[PDB]
Amino acid sequence: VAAFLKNVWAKEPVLVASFAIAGLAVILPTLSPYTKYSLMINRATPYNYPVPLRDDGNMPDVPSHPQDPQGPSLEWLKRL
Amino acid sequence: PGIVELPSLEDLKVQEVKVSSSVLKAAAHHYGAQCDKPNKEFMLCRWEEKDPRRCLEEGKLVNQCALEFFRQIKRHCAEPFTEYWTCIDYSGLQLFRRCRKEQAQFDKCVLDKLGWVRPDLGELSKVTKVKTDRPLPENPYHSRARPEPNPEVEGDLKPARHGSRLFFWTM
Amino acid sequence: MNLMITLLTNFTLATLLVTIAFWLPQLNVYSEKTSPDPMGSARLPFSMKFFLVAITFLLFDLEIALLLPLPWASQTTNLNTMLTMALLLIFLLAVSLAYEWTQKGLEWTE
Amino acid sequence: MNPIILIIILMTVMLGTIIVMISTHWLLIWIGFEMNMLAIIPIMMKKHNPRATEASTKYFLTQSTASMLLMMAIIINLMFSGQWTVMKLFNPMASMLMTMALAMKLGMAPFHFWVPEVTQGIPLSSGLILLTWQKLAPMSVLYQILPSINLDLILTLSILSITIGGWGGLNQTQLRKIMAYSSIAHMGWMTAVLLYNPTMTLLNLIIYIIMTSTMFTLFMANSTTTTLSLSHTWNKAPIMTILVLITLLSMGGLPPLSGFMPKWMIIQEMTKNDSIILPTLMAITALLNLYFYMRLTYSTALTMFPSTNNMKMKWQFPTTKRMTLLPTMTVLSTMLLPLTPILSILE
Amino acid sequence: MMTYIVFILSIIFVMGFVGFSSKPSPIYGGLGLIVSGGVGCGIVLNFGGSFLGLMVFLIYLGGMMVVFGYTTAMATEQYPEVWVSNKVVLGTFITGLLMEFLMVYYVLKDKEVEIVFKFNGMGDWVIYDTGDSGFFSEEAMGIAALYSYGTWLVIVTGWSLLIGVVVIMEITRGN
Amino acid sequence: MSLVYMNIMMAFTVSLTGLLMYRSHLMSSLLCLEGMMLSLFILATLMILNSHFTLASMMPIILLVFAACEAALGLSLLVMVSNTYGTDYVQNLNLLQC
Amino acid sequence: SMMRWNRERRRLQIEDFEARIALMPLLQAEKDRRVLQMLRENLEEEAT
Amino acid sequence: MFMINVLTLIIPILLAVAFLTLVERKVLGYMQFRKGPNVVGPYGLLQPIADAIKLFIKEPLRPATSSISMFILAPILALTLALTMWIPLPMPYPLINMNLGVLFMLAMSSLAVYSILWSGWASNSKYALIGALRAVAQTISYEVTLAIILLSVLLMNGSFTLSTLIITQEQVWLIFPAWPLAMMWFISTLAETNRAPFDLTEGFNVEYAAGPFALFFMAEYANIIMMNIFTTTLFLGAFHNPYMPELYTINFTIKSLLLSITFLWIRASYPRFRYDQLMHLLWKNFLPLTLALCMWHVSLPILLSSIPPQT
């Protein structure tokens, strides 16, 4: 499992490089901390119009102006 | 069918905002900051009514508040704004990233002479709540009543009377 | 519109250069010549290997046709599913390649 | 063929039929038919002889034409309905195209002209698959689109299929072509009762698959492909002699055997709907199938017996062949008629 | 004249199939199908289907019709044709193709305008630019959704392509 | 119905009539079959782009890929025929008359 | 380097999209008046 | 005004292809310890004009063609696809600015094998047909890794736009995160155009005259210059000031000349592959590494949160 690895690195380095790159491409998106930021950036990219809501009277988490405190903020994206 | 009720030409006339798209894109973030309320009441009326014929006057309110946005730039800070939208206007894709010193001059002169804060990255894409006095549409699709569903099955399931009733099979 | 004009101009320049290349030396009255290669009168034998590499091109080209919208699919919200299906398509292209390997399909044009 | 590759290809055939059976979308119907054809093409070429390549070429041409006509019917449905649910079709042009395409995939007449050829070109197990498993997916689509199937067209195809599958069985000594014309006649029987009671369609399908599988399993157990080669069964394995022929007496449609179970039930659903002439004509043609297949029964259980001397050597060796489910399928293809009201499980 | 251009291409498209459904040769059949693929691709591209038109070129024409011409060229043993000096070897080609465009322009006659003008599409047919879409081709995002939404579709498609490789390698063996 | 759809259907039926009257070769049959597939691609694409139905835009590519794989299968069948007789003639494919 | 620059380009894409979002009420109101202008003109010329 | 722009693209392409023959013969001269042409013009500057006037009045071979139409449509298609590959190339702004210029170029280069195939069948020779089938098999083989390498690189771009590819590389060259893709791309473009050491046609279109051979020749060299410019844009993308586009134009011109002379310097250095050895190079060396790097450049912007913008 180690002498076989040295043998296949001696005979066929192309397939060893291919299986190593493919194995890292499989495992490393889960072992990474920055993978969640890909999800967050792709879900915070505004392709549509943010259709507003009628104010029924009791919605504390929804702002009234873009320059309000509450609302989803992208301080993490500006700073990183 | 019924005659579609299109409004008259006099009910459509308004004072247009006759500026080009680079003028609008250079003046976009401050317009989203300062002209928030009639814009969101109009687009709430536009997605609730699903009909522009009932969204006319609020739309004119947009076209009443956009011009007063630009006049207040024209009285105070027309020259940094002109120097900014000219550099916006040069580019093919109209990049914000090519015009940062003219952006800083326009934001500085606007924050001084008018006090407008350019919004942060992430804020203009927010879903906001809108307080209106107009009613909620009870049927925006103008749909008629649904046909009544079939009566469902109920009751305890009894065995079949004398089996299958298939010619001579008694079970 | 500009693309159609450009294609038409490229086609016109191509046909013009071909027409000049055929009609300009046919001004010459040089010689009418007679008496018409590694085979003289042999038929063509078919080769199975050339057809195998053609069909291998076609099947991997279909797999590439599936792989083509990936720079657009990177922008989606369901990135875990998108990554799983992208890796699954490239893995199935690799499994097709390994099956082409081990059954001696890539031999004498390896 | 590599047996792992054989298992993978057979599971792909089953997967294509299952994708046609379970899908609510027309593109997946088309995908399942494409997968089914693509995977069944090496099953025909298991032996690598020119008759299998000819059979696979004819099968590819007919099933590909049927697949393209199916996709044109799907496209015209998307015109006149804007949607993709596997339900009734919203244009009788798309209905006629899908009915013609499914009749081509089943090999119903007048698109029957590939069924006795291809079944002749391929081995007995691949012919078994072609005449049992490949019926299941187009009959499932016909089960799911019957509010749009034209009555006159499906009855025309049904009675033409029964007449041509009847008159195809005269001039044949090949067992595989006789099973192919029996296939054509039974598909006419199945699509006769489709717009009246599709439970009897599924009953006819299940009884047909059981009888066809019993017959092909007997043909594989004896390795006989012609009538004249079937005629030596009495001297080699005498228990094999009659089971073929009581199963074929079932396949004609003859009481008290269970092959009388479909046709009678079909008549039992067509005299309800005030059609008296049409089941009368179709079952007179079934008696014509009895005529030719009873002549084959006379050929094997009686007159044309005589053996050759090398048969004496076959007496010193039993059948080591897998006769898989052959007693079960032989019991289920004859003695099922006293359990005829089991058909309610197919609703 | 310029308005009816998609319709014009469609007419040429129909005529293109009459180039090879009459079947003069499999090689000229492939040539007519390549020309028909190009003009049907023009029909696709003129509704804003840019990616689908480039799949016609890249996968149908440059991917599959290359293989059809390749397999055809490994069959159907060739023979020479007329090879006189330039009054035959290119002049007959130019007069024949000018007669082909004469046939293309020749069908737009009084029997055509009774169908064109009574059922005028151009003016109200090509409606792909009906309003705004945004910062994205809707057709591009619909093809992009093959990976997030089309999980079962990609599974059965990749399985069919793997089975296609296996099936071709089993039937093209002879053993 | 509509006009350009009628043209694409006309091409489909013309390549069908070419696919239903064989002259000499099996390659002519495969070419008419793939002209049918091409017309199915064109007509599906124009419907899907017309209605702005977004998720079906992957459908013609699917309709391409499978069917192109289908064509590959057909080409391989032709090759095996041309390895037995030397030509791809459909009149060499008549041994299954008996 | 591609990490930092693709992240910065995503922030620029969000800035351009917020410019679009801030302009969409005016463009939608002008689009509504555009189509109602043209349909009233088509109605009057249809009536004459 | 647009036709002026089309002519100012297509006439300098033909002039650059004409003088590429001079640059090739001079650089292959000095690398082979000899001189290249210097007698005809001053330092050889009239050798392309003399060669062109020689080839365009040379006798046609009176070709025994198996077809008229494919014999004419193979040089026509060769020149048309040689010219139309240039129209989306951003220099820094292309002739046809299209959203899918990369995919357009991949499609129009995948259509370029029909000139080879129609030149092969339009000859009566079975040997020329066998050579054409081998060339077609080689070219469609290497188009696979063209497509996969090109897709893997454009996973860092965001879209198939060639002008966006200039915006992508404003901070770093794209050869730094993608040099294995760069070197396999470069050998794959070397093997597309049947360029040495992949030139087994000199180891199919000889049925033609010398004039139509000059047409196939100049289409091949336009493809060489075009793929060098496309590789320059794709991996060594230059700085661009929108107020002075000549900085980008001189910069990618110098890089394109260096990469074309790198083709000229590869062809004067190596022996040819045997045919199965370059099929081994594609199907058993470049294709596993290329698929692994395709998986890598899919899954890498997801794990590094470096997913490029769509627009």
Ligand SMILES: CCCCCCCCCCCCCCCCCC(=O)OC[C@H](COP(=O)([O-])OC[C@H](O)COP(=O)([O-])OC[C@H](COC(=O)CCCCCCCCCCCCCCCCC)OC(=O)CCCCCCCCCCCCCCCCC)OC(=O)CCCCCCCCCCCCCCCCC
């Ligand atoms: C405290 C806890 C413990 C308490 C214990 C309590 C029980 C103790 C006794 C345990 C054993 C019970 C056995 C079953 C009960 C009696 C069933 C019965 O006789 O039904 C009369 C049944 C109708 O008469 P019934 O007067 O209306 O009913 C009197 C009872 O109340 C019948 O009552 P039902 O209203 O329930 O009747 C049900 C219904 C009544 O039937 C109907 O509603 C009409 C459907 C009948 C079938 C018509 C089909 C016609 C076309 C196909 C003909 C095929 C060829 C015929 C056979 C040829 C040779 C294989 O039956 C069916 O639908 C099923 C089909 C008939 C099966 C009968 C049971 C057979 C079991 C053994 C089979 C052995 C092979 C026999 C021959 C195979 C064919 C039957 O008779 C017939 O249909 C005649 C056929 C022969 C009947 C089988 C006699 C059973 C014993 C046979 C032993 C000897 C076998 C010799 C070797 C093999 C043959 C060569």
Ligand SMILES: CCCCCCCCCCCCCCCCCC(=O)OC[C@H](COP(=O)([O-])OCC[N+](C)(C)C)OC(=O)CCCCCCCCCCCCCCCCC
């Ligand atoms: C874009 C601008 C240009 C780019 C650069 C290109 C310019 C330089 C050109 C030089 C001249 C080329 C002449 C022709 C070349 C043709 C021959 C040739 O070289 O064939 C290719 C050769 C072929 O090798 P071969 O032919 O010797 O192999 C023999 C094979 N067997 C034994 C089976 C017979 O090499 C390759 O295929 C390699 C390609 C590049 C690989 C890059 C791998 C990067 C590293 C990955 C990770 C590895 C470690 C493992 C994981 C570690 C993790 C930490």
Ligand SMILES: CCCCCCCCCCCCCCCCCC(=O)OC[C@H](COP(=O)(O)OCCN)OC(=O)CCCCCCCCCCCCCCCCC
């Ligand atoms: C799980 C991650 C994703 C994996 C899938 C994606 C992979 C991308 C690359 C695809 C490659 C497709 C083709 C692979 C075929 C493998 C079989 C093979 O090539 O066997 C033959 C070979 C012996 O060489 P030979 O036969 O002589 O070659 C002819 C020329 N001389 O035999 C060999 O050379 C041995 C080759 C197999 C063993 C290689 C081991 C590499 C290990 C690298 C480090 C660990 C990586 C982690 C994953 C484990 C991978 C095994």
Ligand SMILES: CCCCCCCCCCCCCCCCCC(=O)OC[C@H](COP(=O)(O)OCCN)OC(=O)CCCCCCCCCCCCCCCCC
């Ligand atoms: C609402 C209902 C829904 C549907 C219900 C279910 C429908 C089932 C339809 C079954 C169709 C089965 C077709 C045949 C099996 C498929 C695989 C196959 O062919 O296996 C046979 C196998 C092949 O072995 P091989 O080595 O190739 O033999 C040839 C000589 N060398 O081995 C042999 O050849 C050995 C010989 C015996 C093979 C017997 C196979 C019988 C299978 C069918 C059983 C009956 C049907 C299922 C039960 C009733 C349901 C209808």
Ligand SMILES: CCCCCCCCCCCCCCCCCC(=O)OC[C@H](COP(=O)(O)OCCN)OC(=O)CCCCCCCCCCCCCCCCC
């Ligand atoms: C043997 C015959 C002669 C051989 C030599 C000549 C023919 C072969 C060589 C030339 C090939 C022609 C290719 C024509 C289409 C190329 C693809 C294409 O149009 O892509 C560009 C573009 C898509 O990009 P995108 O940015 O999305 O579009 C603008 C959106 N804002 O889309 C557009 O810009 C669309 C522009 C309008 C549509 C153009 C339609 C062209 C005419 C129809 C096809 C003509 C060729 C037919 C025969 C082909 C034979 C191979």
